[PDB]
């Protein structure tokens, strides 16, 4: 049961999570200029709302 070294895989789980998160984040880099402007305006909305709340 232990010959696959389960603790090694459990500690390799963060590497898999980092790979999945990087692949998910790279979907934002689609290369569309209109999406870049939209993301800048979305970030402006988020920054303004966070400053208004706090």
């Amino acid at each position: 049961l232990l010959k696959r070294d389960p603790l090694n895989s459990m500690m390799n789980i963060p590497a898999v999570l980092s790979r999945f998160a990087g692949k998910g984040l790279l979907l934002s880099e689609n290369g569309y200029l209109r999406w870049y402007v939209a993301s800048m305006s979305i970030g402006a909305v988020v920054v303004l709302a966070l400053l208004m709340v706090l």
Partner: protein
């Protein structure tokens, strides 16, 4: 007896209208038009702020704003001319090759 709030509200309305025109339009010419609207709205906001405080600083910043606006309009229209010369269309979604 003209409120500063009303002038800033008008400038904000024009700014978000220019931003909406910049986002929703795929034509690069309308994107440049929207950019001109946003920078003119920011310059109007500076003029309103300078007129509220009775200072010439708002008009000085307006002058700097329109110097920037003229120069970026020139650069953006040259880029638009090159894009129309080498692509024969102004669809900004077509130029999306580098990604990821």
């Amino acid at each position: 007896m003209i409120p500063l709030q009303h002038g800033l509200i008008l400038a904000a309305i024009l700014f978000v209208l220019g931003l909406t025109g910049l986002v929703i339009r795929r034509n690069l010419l309308f994107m440049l038009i929207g950019l001109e609207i946003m920078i003119n709205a920011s310059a109007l906001a500076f003029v309103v702020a300078g007129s509220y405080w009775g200072q010439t600083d708002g008009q000085v910043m307006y002058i700097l704003a329109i110097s920037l606006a003229a120069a970026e309009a020139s650069i953006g229209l040259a880029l638009l001319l090159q894009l129309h010369r080498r692509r024969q269309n102004l669809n900004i979604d077509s130029v999306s090759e580098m990604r990821g």
